[PDB]
């Protein structure tokens, strides 16, 4: 079943947003499938945002997010990558839908509070670079024969 | 004053998430004015869904509908048939927006958590079909001289 | 930094949705700066919204808004002119978006929950109207540098 890479940013963290964002992913109908809090080393945050090294914004990026730890998760159901992206919100969070996490968390656009795969692919590359396998538990539960035909 | 039919599906009722859906309907400002858990019977589901008879969904439909109970609805407001479906989200859960129920609790389109009704109508013909109006109350609240002018 | 009007409308007072409607305002980021719980001077009414004085809505708009207590408040955040209107949604209830304040929790354009200044501005103007400034405190609080760059 499809899979995306998500990730909880360290401004959701420094303001105790975790339980909040994961609980609009979990009811959502979306299985957390890997998980895990960690402090971003430099080169890892270089490599996943490698595509945003001539920006106006990149130097920021990268301090940001290895300014504080972030909860990295895979994350597993039909769609998953464009659902997550839609309950996410768009990338300004003054923009993003109310009822997403960006539109009602998020104020400005470089502290947007979660990062989303992009598209099938970006997440997967997104999901082998930040997990190993034996990371990823796979696992049945009983509301998935709710979910889908 | 306009009512429309409501139904929490068996997937939100196998998901239980009755309370949660009741009250995105209750806190929006909308009456409940009859509701009841049933199993939907055969021929009811079949007469519910009768224009849907040749579609390719159709017997998936009859099915899931009839696989475990509903929570059926009447619920009462100005405007009630288009304030339920603007509530309710667009019928593909991955496109219905962010703060719909579709939109937050809603994976596949064949699995959308609540049926409403689409018309003045269709409303209504359904709650004649689901109920009789001994089963439906009438009753004034508190509320109602803030809801309205 | 940028501020806003915000009034928490007699409607909202009535149904008890004060700590709801505030709650969406704070976990979005915004910074409650000045706060009142206040019964609306039928003057001041009048002044706050000279601009609808010829609308058909008008005399309806000065009766309910001066019909129990409102809770006036001027909120801070970088574009929070436009932030708190994107949270608080279209005018009509029944077009707000789902996820925002009136789109969950109002039912008609003349009992939609809450007002917010519609530009910086009327903003602010609304501010100047409503609050001395001995009213309006300022102070950092510990998530703004989680909230900007
Ligand atoms: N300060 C600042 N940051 C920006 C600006 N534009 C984009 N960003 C940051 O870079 C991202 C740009 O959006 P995308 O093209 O989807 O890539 P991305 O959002 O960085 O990827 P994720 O944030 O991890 O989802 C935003 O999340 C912001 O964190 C900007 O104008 N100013
Ligand atoms: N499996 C599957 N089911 C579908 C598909 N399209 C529609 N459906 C189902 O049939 C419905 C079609 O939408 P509508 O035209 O509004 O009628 P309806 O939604 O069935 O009526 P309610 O579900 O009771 O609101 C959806 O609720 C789905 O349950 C599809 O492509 N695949
Ligand atoms: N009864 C009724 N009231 C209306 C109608 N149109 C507008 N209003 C009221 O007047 C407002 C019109 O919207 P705006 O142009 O943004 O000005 P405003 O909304 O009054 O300002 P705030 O309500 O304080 O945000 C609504 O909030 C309603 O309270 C209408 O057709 N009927
Ligand atoms: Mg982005
Ligand atoms: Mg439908
Ligand atoms: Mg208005």
Same mark, same amino acid.
């Given at each position: 079943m499809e899979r995306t890479f998500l990730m909880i940013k360290p401004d959701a963290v420094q303001r105790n947003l975790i339980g909040? *964002?994961?609980? #609009?992913?979990? #009811?959502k109908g979306l299985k957390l499938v890997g998980g895990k809090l960690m402090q971003v080393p430099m080169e890892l945050a270089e490599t996943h945002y490698? &595509? @945003?090294?001539?920006?106006?914004?990149?130097?920021? $990026?990268?301090?940001?997010?290895?300014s504080?730890? *972030?909860?990295?998760?895979? *994350?597993?159901?039909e769609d998953a990558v464009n659902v997550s992206r839609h309950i996410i919100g768009s990338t300004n969070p003054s923009e993003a839908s109310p009822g997403s996490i #960006?539109?009602? $968390?998020? $104020? +400005?656009?470089?502290?947007?509070?979660? @990062?989303?795969?992009?598209?099938?692919?970006?997440?997967? #590359?997104?999901?082998? $670079?930040?997990?190993? &396998?034996?990371?990823? +538990?796979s696992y049945a539960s009983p509301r998935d024969a709710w979910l889908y035909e």
């Open positions: 909040e *964002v994961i609980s #609009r992913i979990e #009811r490698g &595509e @945003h090294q001539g920006k106006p914004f990149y130097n920021d $990026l990268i301090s940001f997010i290895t504080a730890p *972030v909860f990295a998760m895979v *994350v597993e159901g #960006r539109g009602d $968390l998020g $104020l +400005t656009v470089g502290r947007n509070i979660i @990062h989303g795969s992009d598209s099938l692919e970006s997440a997967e #590359r997104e999901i082998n $670079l930040w997990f190993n &396998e034996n990371e990823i +538990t």
